[PDB]
Design a protein around this ligand. Structure first.
Ligand SMILES: [Mg+2]
Ligand SMILES: [Mg+2]
Ligand SMILES: [Mg+2]
Ligand SMILES: [Mg+2]
Ligand SMILES: [Mg+2]
Ligand SMILES: [Mg+2]
Ligand SMILES: [Mg+2]
Ligand SMILES: [Mg+2]
Ligand SMILES: [Mg+2]
Ligand SMILES: [Mg+2]
Ligand SMILES: [Mg+2]
Ligand SMILES: [Mg+2]
Ligand SMILES: [Mg+2]
Ligand SMILES: [Mg+2]
Ligand SMILES: [Mg+2]
Ligand SMILES: [Mg+2]
Ligand SMILES: [Mg+2]
Ligand SMILES: [Mg+2]
Ligand SMILES: [Mg+2]
Ligand SMILES: [Mg+2]
Ligand SMILES: [Mg+2]
Ligand SMILES: [Mg+2]
Ligand SMILES: [Mg+2]
Ligand SMILES: [Mg+2]
Lengths: 33, 141, 180, 56
RNA sequence: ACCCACUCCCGACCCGGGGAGGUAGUGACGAAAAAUAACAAUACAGGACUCUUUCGAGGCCCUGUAAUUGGAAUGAGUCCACUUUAAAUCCUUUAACGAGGAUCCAUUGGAGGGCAAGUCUGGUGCCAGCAGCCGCGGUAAUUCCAGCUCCAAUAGCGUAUAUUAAAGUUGCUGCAGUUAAAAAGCUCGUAGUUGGAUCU
């Protein structure tokens, strides 16, 4: 099952309260670390 | 520009010595007015007697009532507003008690929403607030 | 005034950045591979290697014919060859900079007990050493961080008093035999 | 302001007792478990790296 | 608290004295080493390996996880003795006892970013509170109070204060002065600083 999309989360919450989280998630999706 | 002569050591040293006084922290540490005005007198901690309990309104945009205590130090007799940091710890302090007070963490500068408060309570009635909060020790009574 | 000595020093340095992912992964890999107790044991060997490198770099700034360089670099290379980190053919002062921490980690008694077949695991090797089952050519050693010299490599064995090296059976065997 | 609401929330949270868990290993054994869990035992992944405490 | 046994000092002295000094007691100032488990069989899961094109196949090997089994190894303690010492204590050496929940139970701070680690569940509802800073909390709180889980160091870990690096934010190395802080309204001038070539 495909539950969470980091790209959508960042693009939607980049200016919200949960920005610092989603950015931190997006890097994990990109750099593999 | 600066002088680069071979015999200009006195000029350079004198200029640096005189221009060090325009540094805020060097002047604060070497002038003596701050040490005289410091209620602790340079100590890390102090002991005082709780004069009363007060509530300080948190600065905007935050809205809350920070519980504090007015105390009077034993060595010099100065009056100080100290913060009691925890959920419900103000019920561990009674009036006319003896408390240990330390700094707030910013070297005499106010921290957070609390205006003009730079001290916090550590131990009350010779027992630590952490032990009372975690229920490890009881009030002596 | 007293007749005591106050000479002492620390054997490790803490890293500047407390939470660095790459450093944590590397240190945990080292701990897992060599069965170390904590991060401090890695930092101790790192400090030792740093001191050796600092001495070698300080001796490389002198002239080749300087008497102090010739005297002290020779001693440093001799000690490195003695402990086994260096080789006889690589006894130049530049090769010291080519040393790594794994070379010093390979010379501990804990890893040498495991590599010689006395133990079936590195943790088992540490347990055997700490429980007084291993002797070094005459002497019972129970310090895992013991650094084995080259000439002592052939002389690691079970202690004569150990149940493994021909000694009396242990507590559990005696109790079980008493049971039956 | 009024000081009568001190300890309001901490005195309202319903009490929950901690459960019983097997004791954790310490020292070298804890590091051995961490080393075997993070590096020795790894499952194939498709690039979506998950944290140790990810949930939902 | 014990002793002049060591180191030395004084005296008419090889003999006397010494809270000088030495030895014990308190002692997480601080420094060094280093336990809190190891192994085997099962029960599952991955890899390599082969044969089978695929369903597949295996003690055929290697590696991981079990309050599933099993018997081995131990010092923390209790404690003869010797040794240690002026007499002791401690350490070392050794008899006997001494581990399966091996209950002989490791803690200190965090889980939005800085900075390693959960927008999981239940409460509260700009209150209580957290927060070094940015900030969170006004009925779906990733930040408060709790449970679970997860991080970091580890017999150690938080807090307050002085101080060093970070600070090329005191700049000798090595900072700036048009507009971000900044060159005297202008000129003269003593001390100070600096000073053109040329001699084998
Ligand atoms: Mg100011
Ligand atoms: Mg607010
Ligand atoms: Mg004497
Ligand atoms: Mg005498
Ligand atoms: Mg004395
Ligand atoms: Mg004395
Ligand atoms: Mg220490
Ligand atoms: Mg224990
Ligand atoms: Mg915790
Ligand atoms: Mg929480
Ligand atoms: Mg953070
Ligand atoms: Mg992170
Ligand atoms: Mg603000
Ligand atoms: Mg809610
Ligand atoms: Mg919630
Ligand atoms: Mg500084
Ligand atoms: Mg610098
Ligand atoms: Mg400054
Ligand atoms: Mg430079
Ligand atoms: Mg500047
Ligand atoms: Mg200006
Ligand atoms: Mg002008
Ligand atoms: Mg002049
Ligand atoms: Mg000239």
């Amino acid at each position: 099952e495909l539950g969470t999309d980091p790209y959508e989360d960042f693009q939607e919450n980049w200016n919200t309260k949960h920005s610092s989280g989603v950015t931190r998630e997006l890097m994990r999706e990109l750099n593999g670390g | 520009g600066k002088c680069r002569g071979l015999r200009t050591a006195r000029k350079l040293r004198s200029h640096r010595r005189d221009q060090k006084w325009h540094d805020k922290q060097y002047k604060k540490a070497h002038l003596g007015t701050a040490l005289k005005a410091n209620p602790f007198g340079g100590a890390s901690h102090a002991k005082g007697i709780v004069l009363e309990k007060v509530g300080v309104e948190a600065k905007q945009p935050n809205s809350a009532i920070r519980k504090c205590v007015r105390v009077q130090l034993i060595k010099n007799g100065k009056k100080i507003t100290a913060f009691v940091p925890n959920d419900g710890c103000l019920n561990f302090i009674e009036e006319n008690d003896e408390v240990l007070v330390a700094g707030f963490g910013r070297k005499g500068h106010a921290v957070g929403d609390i205006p003009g408060v730079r001290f916090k309570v550590v131990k009350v009635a010779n027992v630590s607030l952490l032990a009372l909060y975690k229920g490890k020790k009881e009030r002596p009574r | 005034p007293v007749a005591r000595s106050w000479v002492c020093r620390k054997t490790y340095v803490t890293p500047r950045r407390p939470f660095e992912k790459s450093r944590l992964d590397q240190e945990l890999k080292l701990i897992g591979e060599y069965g170390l107790r904590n991060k401090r044991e890695v930092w101790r060997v790192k400090f030792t290697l740093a001191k050796i490198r600092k001495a070698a770099r300080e001796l490389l700034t002198l002239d080749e014919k300087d008497p102090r360089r010739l005297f002290e670099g020779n001693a440093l290379l001799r000690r490195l060859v003695r402990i086994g980190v260096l080789d006889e053919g690589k006894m130049k002062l530049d090769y010291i900079l080519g040393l790594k921490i794994e070379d010093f980690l390979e010379r501990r008694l804990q890893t040498q007990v495991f590599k010689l077949g006395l133990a079936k695991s590195i943790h088992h090797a540490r347990v055997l050493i700490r429980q007084r089952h291993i002797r070094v050519r005459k002497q019972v050693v129970n310090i895992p961080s013991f650094i084995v010299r080259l000439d002592s490599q052939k002389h690691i064995d079970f202690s004569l008093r150990s149940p493994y090296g021909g000694g009396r059976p242990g507590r559990v065997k005696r109790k079980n035999a008493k049971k039956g | 302001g009024s000081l009568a609401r001190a300890g309001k929330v901490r005195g309202q949270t319903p009490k929950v007792a901690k459960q019983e868990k097997k004791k954790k290993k310490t020292g070298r054994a804890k590091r051995r478990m961490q080393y075997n869990r993070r590096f020795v035992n790894v499952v194939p992944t498709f690039g979506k790296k998950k944290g140790p405490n990810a949930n939902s």
